[PDB]
Design a protein around this ligand. Structure first.
Ligand SMILES: N[C@@H](CC(=O)O)C(=O)O
Ligand SMILES: N[C@@H](CC(=O)O)C(=O)O
Ligand SMILES: N[C@@H](CC(=O)O)C(=O)O
Ligand SMILES: N[C@@H](CC(=O)O)C(=O)O
Lengths: 328, 328, 328, 328
């Protein structure tokens, strides 16, 4: 059987309450032992080890945990015995973690993120099936060199493309600019596409000596907008600002003036959009070269923030950062 | 022929350059005369008058223009001769203006907003067809008491439900929580549903004596979030804050603490979501009663902001504002 | 507590195996007693009675069962004590049954159809939550006069609009031309729209004395198509044919010739589309008046078949049937 | 400039009426000269030659035209000077032609299909932009070895995945199981994914000596279904039958019996679904091995028909054809 490590970042996503007997096997973490008792079929698929990386809701995630997680995944995948890693994660910020890992994990071995939109104690809990399917995706031969993926609701999503698009639905994850790369239905894994954007082993980013990430704020645009939030971000030491613009990345005029001042001060200003899908394009209404801004193209604000944080570990140059957005 | 007024808020959405002869008829505004020359078939459908309300891109919209527009629409629809109004508008913030009018226009006569995702001078410009269809919707007997609608890409969307969900596509408008209420295909209008949430003549809001709207800021949530933007909004005199939360409206802990302090000071804090669709629900992970927050339910951040601005013209009471979010 | 009857058309959609004790209460049907044991929370919401109408997979449905079901629902809802009916049904043809009931049930009281895309013995079975939500929708005051609805995956779909759009997903039901009319999330029911097309008490159709429905076949169009299936339908005594055309209802020329001959013989030919969404329109490429065909407008082939079957109980007149398609 | 050939299969998709002067250049086909006059910017991108392959609406397409087109495309792409082919085509059956070419063109050079949902003479015609973008996709370096693509509405779709999913909308094309592989916005081409299913140079099929394709019929399933259409297809010499089944490919019992008899006679029976998306899976409710059927997995009925036609040029063996459906 293949060997896989499950890294937990919070509580259990499958099952509820205490186990009906004390397991003889310890996987290495109580959360993971609880998963193996809730979804016993996973033991027939792989030898499972477990680790508790953090113990939080995903809305409490920080860069410090991202760095810890990425360094550990890199260590685990460098081991000959370890065939893949599965990370159990809260759904709220799963897309941000997945995208961060997709640029920092230096391996072709599968890395699968999975969660649950319903509590494990709920009627019709989705966690058990989501986990079972995640293990099957982690051990599949075709999963190699696909990048980091999210497995939810019988679907396999590329980390660059995935987002949570609904507050409550079991089918909340989507890839609105490209679609799922594959499917997993009662453990049967099939891929139909793959990303052509560089990831994992092909990424230029290396976080192995980084202890803290650069500060990047996100602003939400609207009619009758303001300069005071730009100013407060600058005052708090923001190294970058993602602006979630109206339509195709458009600012209100007062805010634009403030962003232009931020960019001149050396804070990188990257234009995204509040709309949900599509590219925030170059050479539309905003003269990015004249103002000193980067266009984020086909991302969203929260994933753009992750990429700009990584870029800022290397450079604050506008052209070099535009090239990063136009590559990854 | 029915009499309709077209109100322009910027430039032409159809045609490009100068007219091939000087019209004998003036509709009342040069922009509208240019529309009638670009889409001459509309003159066979209605007697068209025109007015220029503002001359801006929609990313430059302000509450002052919203108030001017709402008061003028109410004046026009009070005239016996005027059967409907059409408003030409930039796409970026069309959903905000439409939602504002849906709660402030005191009439059952149709109010249609229309725009264009491509320039009128572009190949395959969408403005001419969008406008032709908009006039057909405005004059249709079934359009009475539907509320304010957006007509784009052969679709009729209810203002409560409509949003721009893509940066560039001609089909960028959607109603992600309910779908379009009708269709309009080469001018043939058909309704399949109507909103059951109160609007227009049934709305409690009245802006006839309001000269300035309450300040309401929007915040974009993310991992490793901050208190400084909350604090800057408070300092700039925000009467309300929309928080675009992670997942089902969840804040990061530092931010939650700052929002709790805002709410205690009498600034209304309303929880929405950054995700794009679904309800930001009551009685999920955030104890709204204990912290002093409102749940915005099935809106999005930018329409929640419009409703909170209107609510704040009447009250800052938490319970009363929750009832308003649960009604409209 | 309100009184509701659950009518089963096959097996259980929630739970698996035998009950852990023999219930003292009999609801009136073993399948329903099994549902009450699998989802005990439903007993706190309503007094439940049960009946077994048929015992089949939905792919085995026949007009005979539709007639039995419709007559029984009409009898139950005529009783003062009965507040609503819930029908448990296989997903495959749930849309056809729902649409048939929406034109034949002469009552404003709620009629809710519900099923499960996963077996009740599966990990993460959706039936328990789907049923719980269905009962909550059946007892809600706002559900009155909404027509027949389908409740799946936390969504409320109007029967006229609903379809199964995916082979396996828990989120397979959709309303592709209009969207869901409401939501139901852990039993909390909210409506946002309603149909404006006539249904239930406002329908002209009455099946109380009908023992067998007219035969209507469906044909699937494609390049290099044929006349032999039209001919075989005619030979088998088809009273109507739904043609699932290419694009906006277009036939291949050989097939068109055969359909024109069918229509001249008195068999009603109604044009739908194989594409999945949108209206099959009048006055596009096919001259329906000259050829003797009906355009089905905003339906799909299988729901068009249901409406044409009902129309054929009354008339074979082309204009009268076009009016039926353009009304319901 | 790169040299590209445009092959027309019907009339012009852009422009309308006569040219304002007689061109000095002939591209080689009057339809193509009319395109170059309607969209003159294309002449700055490439040296364009033109050919008229057929003169029909796409609803009149036959296997004979598919064979002529595939052989000609193979001849052209074997020429050193020819960098790509563009094919103008009716939208109704564009997905079938594209899928056929994707399995029969023996080249990595780009092959782009393009059409228009509105007439060139319409207001807001989409053909001019669609064609401009199609030429930009054809000449882009990243378009090599992507397989055959459909370019519509600013989107690049893989032929294996693309379908017309709406009767009338300009955004009618979709890839419901995977999404678009790239974008093209005012000629700026970007790819985000590529198909991992074999195509073009990697396909086993070769049509160079085939003069007529095997007959394959499609049947539309429904409640109270019949055996007479199966029987008529057999009688007309069908070598294969695609069954568009209820839900996950389920037949009605009478029909299943007739299909079992067909399969025993050596007619290949392949199960697809009427639903619109998802896989028609193996090992669900239908025992394919026992009955002698193939599961078409993640296609739709009309593309399953194209693949079964090509499979039947080589074999009628059940297992071998299941492998073909599981590969391509
Ligand atoms: N708030 C939870 C949501 C979930 O996991 O569904 C989390 O993000 O940790
Ligand atoms: N930025 C423009 C976009 C458009 O109209 O499409 C506006 O909102 O005014
Ligand atoms: N074939 C089953 C499918 C389901 O219920 O999910 C039925 O239609 O009865
Ligand atoms: N019926 C036309 C439709 C179009 O091109 O949009 C065809 O397929 O040729």
């Amino acid at each position: 059987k293949p060997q896989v490590t499950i890294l937990a970042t919070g509580g259990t996503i499958a099952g509820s309450g205490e186990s009906s007997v004390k397991s003889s096997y310890s996987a290495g973490a109580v959360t993971v032992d609880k998963l193996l008792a809730a979804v016993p079929a996973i033991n027939d698929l792989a030898t499972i080890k477990g680790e508790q990386i953090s113990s939080i809701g995903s809305q409490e995630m920080t860069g410090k945990v991202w760095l810890k997680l990425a360094k550990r995944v890199n260590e685990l995948l460098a081991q000959k015995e370890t065939e893949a890693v599965i990370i159990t994660h809260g759904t709220d910020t799963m897309e941000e973690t997945a995208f961060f890992l997709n640029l920092t994990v230096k391996s072709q071995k599968p890395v699968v993120l999975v969660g649950a939109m319903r509590s494990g104690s709920s009627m019709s809990a989705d966690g058990p099936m989501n986990l079972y399917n995640a293990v099957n995706v982690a051990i599949n031969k075709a999963s190699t060199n696909k990048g980091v993926v999210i497995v939810m609701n019988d679907e396999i999503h590329a980390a660059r493309e995935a987002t949570k698009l609904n507050t409550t639905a079991v089918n909340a994850f989507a890839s609105p600019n490209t679609g799922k790369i594959g499917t997993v239905y009662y453990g049967k894994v099939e891929y139909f596409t793959q990303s052509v954007r560089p990831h994992t082993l092909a990424s230029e980013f290396d976080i192995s000596k980084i202890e803290e990430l650069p500060r990047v704020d996100i602003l939400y645009a609207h009619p009758d907008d303001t300069d005071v939030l730009v100013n407060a971000a600058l005052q708090a030491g923001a190294k970058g600002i993602i602006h979630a613009g109206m339509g195709n990345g458009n600012p209100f005029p007062l805010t634009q003036n403030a962003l232009e001042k931020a960019a001149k001060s050396g804070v990188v200003v990257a234009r995204s959009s509040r709309v949900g899908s599509g590219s925030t394009t170059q050479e539309a209404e905003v003269d990015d070269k004249k103002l000193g801004f980067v266009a984020t193209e086909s991302l969203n604000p929260q994933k753009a923030r992750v990429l700009l944080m990584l870029a800022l570990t290397k450079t604050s140059d506008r052209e070099a950062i535009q090239k990063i957005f136009s590559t990854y």
